[PDB]
């Protein structure tokens, strides 16, 4: 009677701990695309600063 709740909880928390971690990796792509697009925008805008100075 002490084995059964401990065994059930050990079975359950093993998958509970790996659960809810998928939210991080599915939210990661939005930040990744935002950072990459803004970084290539940053280098494009630095070149735009140089070309605007030339103009």
């Amino acid at each position: 009677a002490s084995f059964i709740p401990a065994v059930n909880d050990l079975t359950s928390d093993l998958f509970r701990t790996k659960s809810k971690s998928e939210e991080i990796k599915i939210e990661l792509e939005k930040l990744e695309k935002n950072l990459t697009a803004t970084l290539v925008l940053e280098k494009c805008l630095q070149e735009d600063v140089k070309k605007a100075e030339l103009h």
Binding site: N34, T38, L41, L45, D48, K51, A52, H55
Partner: protein
């Protein structure tokens, strides 16, 4: 990110090349220059005839 986005959209105004000058004002300057060149060509033809 939104600030960067409409700042880029306002400065580019749909062109890949940067548009510092007002584009319709720029082509207004260009057509004034071209029509002035045509008038100058007519005037110099009249000067040569005179």
């Amino acid at each position: 990110n939104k600030d960067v986005d409409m700042l880029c959209d306002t400065l580019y105004q749909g062109g890949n090349q940067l548009l510092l000058s007002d584009q319709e004002l720029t082509e207004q300057f260009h057509k004034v220059e071209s029509q002035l060149n045509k008038l100058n060509h007519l005037l110099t033809d009249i000067l040569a005839d005179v």
